[PDB]
Design a protein around this ligand. Structure first.
Ligand SMILES: Nc1nc2c(ncn2[C@@H]2O[C@H](COP(=O)(O)OP(=O)(O)OP(=O)(O)O)[C@@H](O)[C@H]2O)c(=O)[nH]1
Ligand SMILES: Nc1ncnc2c1ncn2[C@@H]1O[C@H](COP(=O)(O)OP(=O)(O)CP(=O)(O)O)[C@@H](O)[C@H]1O
Ligand SMILES: Nc1nc2c(ncn2[C@@H]2O[C@H](COP(=O)(O)OP(=O)(O)O)[C@@H](O)[C@H]2O)c(=O)[nH]1
Ligand SMILES: COc1ccc2c(c1)CCCN2c1nc(Cl)nc2ncccc12
Ligand SMILES: [Ca+2]
Ligand SMILES: [Mg+2]
Ligand SMILES: [Mg+2]
Ligand SMILES: [Mg+2]
Lengths: 437, 332, 54, 427
């Protein structure tokens, strides 16, 4: 057994972390006080779920997690919420004034004063690990803390944990729920600085999650709570192999090996099905073939884009519920004949499949219906670069006029970091084009 | 009001479609780079499909199918037919073609049977009967090009003994309905057909531009369906519908149904339509052959008003409705 | 379809399906860039206080 | 995230008092400072504007400044006058005579240090001071001259805090003295350099609204201040109430101000209401949205169709469909996209607050950074030059030690501000 430490940075990272750990507790039978009746080894163990939970002598199962935000109101809700007993106070870190939607304020001005404290709190968890594998880092692209402080934290983690894998769950900005007009700046700045320090990053476009909630959950105006419960389901599907017995994606290193053949192109596309409303009184349970076929509909992706017009480098299918390999292979044979699934020429055309028999868990009173079977597809397709093209275009429009640049320069950043960051993105988009034509 | 942007000022078709939209009073034109548009009349190269369908509160439509180039480039068309089982290696309405990369593997294998049975053995790039002289031409150029069997026995109009090609305009809407404009046009050669030398190629190349005697038998070397049909009746005792148009509809349907999975926008966050130009060649036996597909065609001055008005009715107002049909729907 | 490396446990199973084969900065540099940025902030603030003193 | 409020001069203290009346009622605080409200959303962010006192009393973090006692006596006599900390009353006796030089250089200089003493005491009690908001007029002497002197000194002692002002622009339609263009031009020069955000409250617009729209034939300052207090309550909603945004003054500045000098906002309000008269039909979300963007609802006498919007912040208050709000706001941008600069994508942000202001079931407040605000500064620049070309009335200022050069400099900077706004209206 090898431990994983989760780090949640900024409002988006913290609130998504809340949703994930709530779901983790429900999936493992861990109560809000940290007790786990099914765990017969009191005070310790090297079970699969111990990758995410440590144990006290009193039988408390404590998330291997740190929450950090430059302002306290969001993490204060964790300190007084349903799962307040779950976390030790020292893993919940807050300042008093946030990055004001400003990457440079989060990375330089305010981040320089709290980075050492955060690394010391992370060191405290690392010392409880017999064989730490790496980190899972949750944050927004658009927030000043989520972008600015995350990139600083990621750099230092490479220095202090050089041999450790680092995975990201990143919230890509969407105007329908976005908060700041400068989020394209913060996204490009943080992506540039973080690119070489991340082994694998799962982007979630709030636009995709928003529309999925409106379309399939019949929520007219989804809130963060609606979005995060859906995101936590996808995050759970992705991390289930780390928390449960199995042969696929059992260590963070395996994510890179299975999903990322080139280091810089390390942004797999997540596609999830089925998303069914709890309110719907009559539902027809979808078969293996139907939910698998849904993995190739852009409407079910975490980022809207067209994989038919890109190339695949890797594809994993993560099933939960009543699924046997025979039906998966049958569904795949049909799908291959009716869909445009092109792989790069230097990669085999194949699916890596994992099945957990336990069907997806849903939070009581939530919006998601209980389903008999679900699947999350992780495909590394060049089509995801459409999202970079979109982001870089918005960046170019504002930066051509230097709009808002004075706010970043005023925090100690140099104008040249804007163009340096943008050039890295131009190279990234070029990489995706070489691999996809 | 509905909003639209114009990003290909060189399009005669959509220049006319702009005016019609403005003339309705319910359409406003924005500047090229304004993102809050309902309709994009996009550029022809590097159209940013990835930026479409991400504007909250705007249903967005574009006049091009992403992925339709696979059909509208000569090299890609040949690959699409040889490798797609729906069309297949032995498709009856596409001439033998081979893709040749200029610094040929199997082309010489067929050309060397050509010398066996002493059959017609002229090919096209640009026309020749000797391979090693068209290949000196391919490589002294630079880009890729296809070499295709030149049809030696075409149908010749009388009087004149003339060669011709048929251009059909086909509109595909956001629902992937396939609409064949009822008006076609024959692009005739004002020169008599000479099969004794292909070096002189004004009687072989039927392009309206390459006809710089031009305008003799009919205005602008354009014979339309009304007259061409009456000709087929007087001359050959048949109709345009029976002898030619059935095969043309079959070919159009086949091509577009083959790529529908790859280019359909049915469940996409943006919507597409596109106007295609299919070019057909008719042989001595009233047999139709597909020559190529144009993804950004122009029209004939006679037909601009009617066809462009039809694009608005079928492709634009169907998605953005306002406050007898000239198309034949090819069913599938 | 080639089905390989099938592994079965009580919790589920995993396997692979093939259709077709193929055709950092140091702590020192971080500390300096953070200090360089802080130098620029303090320079800009000293310029303001100079201007306010005038 | 505490805000320190400062009100200076006659106008500043009169709109400042009404502001505290309006938001005190919205938060359920009475003239004695005791909270007798019904909802806890009233108290969640009460500390932004109120200190807590012995006995669960709420004391506005407000400092009242003037060079003459008269208006401040009226405030302490006013309905809520007993809620302010008595030590936060700082006044002289000589008055400023509608003379910027007196407020900035002579009379004001004698009093400014004792105002900074009160500011320092209020700031030191702050858990984490956001910054300051100043209410003042630009056409007088104390709020204009001493107010901008305070802003300068406040920036010197708190260079990393946000400075926000509600600045009343003079108008010959509502005018006390001919020297108001002089005082306003000198003040705008200060505001361009030493505030992060300035709400341009134009007495010209306030008069026109009372006259043309509210059908008041002879509006008083009390009628003008009714529009001001409703606007000030609106634009501070996201500071005072817990929303999706958790907004503060710095985030407002970061997102609204693409270039540091262009930080002068056009406020707007809907529905437009007169005092002591209640209309009974609530506005639908479409009507709220269309009115809030209407030039007739703008508090700065500028035609928004004469420029382009750099950024916009819109706040809807009341019980309404947020889905309908999103659709209507998207409708405005999509149908009028030429008036929103294309080089700042998605430059219109919306917030919703369930609590409506007193007397209304739904309201909308508009905050616009429009290049059309240059019309306001051009107007003042023309009135300034009409007198300055003859050096008329200058002796009131040279008598306090000022030189003509300083007038020439303020004129040039404001004309620069005008041309800088023009630069981005053509882009
Ligand atoms: N999906 C999701 N997105 C969120 C959530 N909270 C914020 N966001 C998104 O994150 C972006 C803003 O970043 P935040 O995380 O709120 O900001 P921050 O990291 O706390 O940084 P500062 O507040 O600027 O110091 C916007 O695009 C929001 O849409 C959330 O709970 N779920
Ligand atoms: N296999 C073939 N057999 C006989 N004639 C052929 C032929 N291929 C092409 N041609 C003749 O050459 C002419 C031009 O060929 P082609 O259509 O490929 O060029 P092009 O792309 O410039 C015209 P467009 O783009 O309008 O379709 C045709 O009109 C036809 O008369
Ligand atoms: N809107 C509004 N404007 C005022 C009020 N009182 C004065 N003014 C304007 O402010 C300017 C006079 O400044 P004033 O505040 O009275 O002088 P000060 O005491 O020296 O700051 C003129 O432009 C007046 O029209 C008021 O109560 N409301
Ligand atoms: C143009 O983009 C913008 C404009 C303004 C703002 C933001 C982005 C992000 C958060 C801060 N912010 C706001 N701040 C405050 Cl105090 N009140 C607001 N009321 C309505 C809307 C926004 C408000
Ligand atoms: Ca145990
Ligand atoms: Mg935050
Ligand atoms: Mg062509
Ligand atoms: Mg007065």
């Amino acid at each position: 057994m090898r431990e994983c430490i989760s780090i949640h940075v900024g409002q988006a990272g913290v609130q998504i972390g809340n949703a994930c750990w709530e779901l983790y507790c429900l999936e493992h039978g861990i109560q809000p006080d940290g007790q786990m009746p099914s765990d017969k080894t009191i005070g310790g163990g090297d079970d699969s779920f111990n990758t995410f939970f440590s144990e006290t002598g009193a039988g408390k199962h404590v998330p291997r997690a740190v929450f950090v935000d430059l302002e306290p109101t969001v993490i204060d809700e964790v300190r007084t919420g349903t799962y307040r007993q779950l976390f030790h106070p020292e893993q919940l870190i807050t300042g008093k004034e946030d990055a004001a939607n400003n990457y440079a304020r989060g990375h330089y001005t305010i981040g320089k004063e709290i980075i050492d404290l955060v690394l010391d709190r992370i060191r405290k968890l690392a010392d409880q690990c017999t064989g730490l594998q790496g980190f899972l880092v949750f944050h927004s692209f658009g927030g000043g803390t989520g972008s600015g402080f995350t990139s600083l934290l990621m750099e230092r983690l490479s220095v202090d944990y050089g041999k450790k894998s680092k995975l990201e769950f990143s919230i890509y900005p969407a105007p329908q729920v976005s908060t700041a007009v400068v989020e394209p700046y913060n996204s490009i700045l943080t992506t540039h600085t973080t690119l070489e320090h991340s082994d694998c990053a799962f982007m979630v476009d709030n636009e995709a999650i928003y529309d999925i909630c409106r379309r399939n959950l019949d929520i007219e105006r989804p809130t963060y709570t609606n979005l995060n419960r859906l995101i936590s389901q996808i995050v759970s599907s992705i991390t289930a192999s780390l928390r449960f017995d199995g042969a696929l994606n059992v260590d963070l290193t395996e994510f890179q090996t299975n999903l990322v053949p080139y280091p810089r192109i390390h942004f797999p596309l997540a596609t999830y099905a089925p998303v069914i409303s709890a309110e719907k009184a009559y539902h027809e349970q979808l078969s293996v073939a139907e939910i698998t076929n849904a993995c190739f509909e852009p409407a079910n992706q975490m980022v809207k884009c067209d994989p038919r017009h890109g190339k695949y480098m890797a594809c994993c299918l993560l099933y939960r519920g009543d699924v046997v390999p025979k039906d998966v292979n049958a569904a795949i044979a049909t799908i291959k004949t009716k869909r445009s699934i092109q792989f790069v020429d230097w990669c085999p055309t194949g699916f890596k499949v994992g099945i957990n028999y336990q069907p997806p868990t849903v939070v009581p009173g939530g919006d998601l219906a209980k389903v008999q079977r679900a699947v999350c597809m992780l495909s590394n397709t060049t089509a995801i670069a459409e999202a970079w093209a979109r982001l870089d275009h918005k960046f170019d429009l504002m930066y051509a006029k230097r709009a808002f640049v004075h706010w970043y320069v005023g925090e100690g950043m140099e104008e040249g970091e804007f163009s340096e960051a943008r050039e890295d993105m131009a190279a990234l988009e070029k990489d995706y084009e070489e691999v996809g034509v | 009001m509905y909003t639209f942007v114009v990003r290909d000022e060189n399009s005669s078709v959509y220049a006319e479609v702009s005016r019609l939209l403005l003339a309705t009073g319910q359409w406003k034109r924005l500047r090229k780079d304004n993102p809050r548009f309902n309709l994009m009349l996009g550029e022809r190269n590097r159209l940013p499909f990835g930026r479409l369908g991400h504007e909250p509160g705007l249903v967005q439509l574009v006049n091009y199918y992403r992925g339709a180039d696979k059909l509208c480039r000569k090299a890609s068309l040949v690959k699409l037919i040889k490798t797609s089982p729906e069309l297949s290696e032995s498709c009856t309405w596409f001439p033998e073609s081979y893709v040749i990369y200029p610094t040929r593997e199997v082309f010489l294998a067929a050309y060397n049977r050509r010398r066996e049975g002493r059959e017609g053995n002229v090919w096209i790039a640009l026309i020749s009967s000797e391979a090693s002289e068209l290949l000196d031409f391919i490589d002294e150029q630079g880009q890729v090009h296809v070499i295709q069997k030149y049809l030696e026995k075409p149908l010749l109009l009388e009087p004149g003994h003339r060669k011709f090609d048929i251009r059909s305009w086909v509109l595909v809407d956001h629902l992937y309905n396939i609409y064949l404009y009822r008006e076609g046009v024959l692009r005739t050669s004002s020169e008599p057909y000479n099969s004794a030398n292909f070096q002189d190629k004004t009687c072989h190349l039927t392009n309206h531009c390459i006809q710089k005697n031009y305008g003799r038998y009919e205005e602008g070397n354009e014979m339309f369906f009304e007259e061409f049909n009456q000709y087929l009746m007087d001359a050959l005792n048949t109709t345009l519908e029976n002898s030619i148009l059935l095969q043309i509809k079959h070919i159009i349907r086949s091509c577009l149904m083959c790529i529908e999975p790859a280019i359909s926008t049915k469940h996409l966050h943006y919507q597409s339509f596109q106007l295609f130009g299919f070019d057909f060649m008719v042989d001595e036996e009233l047999k139709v052959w597909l020559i190529e597909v144009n993804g950004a065609p122009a029209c004939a001055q006679k037909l601009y008003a009617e066809l462009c008005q039809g694009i608005v009715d079928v492709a634009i107002s169907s998605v953005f409705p306002l406050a007898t049909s000239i198309f034949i729907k090819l069913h599938h | 379809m080639e089905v390989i490396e099938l592994n079965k446990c009580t919790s589920g199973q995993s396997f692979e399906v093939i259709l077709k084969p193929p055709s950092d900065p140091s702590l020192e540099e971080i500390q300096k860039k953070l200090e360089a940025a802080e130098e620029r902030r303090k320079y800009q603030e000293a310029e303001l206080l100079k201007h306010l003193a005038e | 995230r505490e805000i320190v409020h400062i009100q200076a001069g006659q106008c500043g203290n009169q709109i400042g008092a009404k502001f505290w009346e309006v938001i005190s009622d919205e938060h359920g605080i009475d003239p004695t400072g005791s909270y007798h409200g019904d909802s806890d959303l009233q108290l969640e962010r009460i500390n932004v504007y109120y200190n807590e006192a012995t006995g669960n009393k709420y004391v506005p973090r407000a400092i009242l400044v003037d060079l003459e006692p008269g208006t401040m006596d009226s405030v302490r006599s006013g309905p809520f006058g007993q809620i302010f900390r008595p030590d936060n009353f700082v006044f002289g006796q000589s008055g400023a005579g509608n003379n910027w030089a007196k407020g900035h250089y002579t009379e004001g200089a004698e009093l400014v240090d004792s105002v900074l003493d009160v500011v320092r005491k209020e700031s030191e009690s702050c858990d984490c001071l956001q910054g300051f908001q100043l209410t003042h007029s630009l056409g007088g002497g104390t709020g204009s001259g001493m107010g901008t002197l305070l802003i300068s000194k406040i920036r010197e002692e708190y260079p990393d805090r946000i400075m926000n002002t509600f600045s009343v622009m003079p108008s010959p339609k509502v005018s006390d003295t001919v020297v108001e263009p002089y005082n306003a031009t000198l003040s705008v020069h200060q505001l361009v350099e030493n505030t992060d955000e300035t709400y341009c409250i134009d007495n010209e617009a306030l008069y026109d609204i009372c006259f043309r729209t509210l059908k008041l034939t002879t509006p008083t300052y009390g009628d003008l201040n009714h529009l001001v207090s409703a606007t000030m309550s609106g634009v501070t909603t996201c500071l005072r109430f817990p929303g999706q945004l958790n907004a503060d003054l710095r985030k407002l500045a970061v997102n609204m101000v693409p270039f540091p000098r262009l930080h002068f906002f056009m406020p707007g309000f809907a529905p437009l209401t007169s005092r002591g008269s209640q209309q009974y039909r609530a506005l639908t979300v479409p009507e709220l949205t269309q009115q809030m963007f209407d030039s007739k609802n703008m508090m700065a006498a500028c035609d928004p169709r004469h420029g382009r919007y750099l950024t916009v912040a819109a706040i809807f208050r009341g019980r309404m469909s947020m889905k309908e709000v999103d659709e209507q706001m998207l409708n405005v941008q999509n149908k009028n996209s030429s008036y929103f600069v294309e080089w700042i994508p998605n430059n219109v942000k919306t917030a919703v607050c369930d609590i409506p202001p007193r007397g209304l079931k739904m309201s909308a407040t508009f905050i616009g950074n429009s290049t059309a605000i240059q019309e306001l500064f051009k107007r003042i620049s023309e009135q300034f030059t009409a007198m300055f070309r003859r050096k008329a009335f200058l002796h009131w200022y040279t008598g306090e030690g000022m030189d003509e050069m300083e007038f020439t400099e303020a004129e040039s900077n404001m004309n620069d501000l005008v041309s800088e706004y023009q630069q981005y209206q053509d882009a």
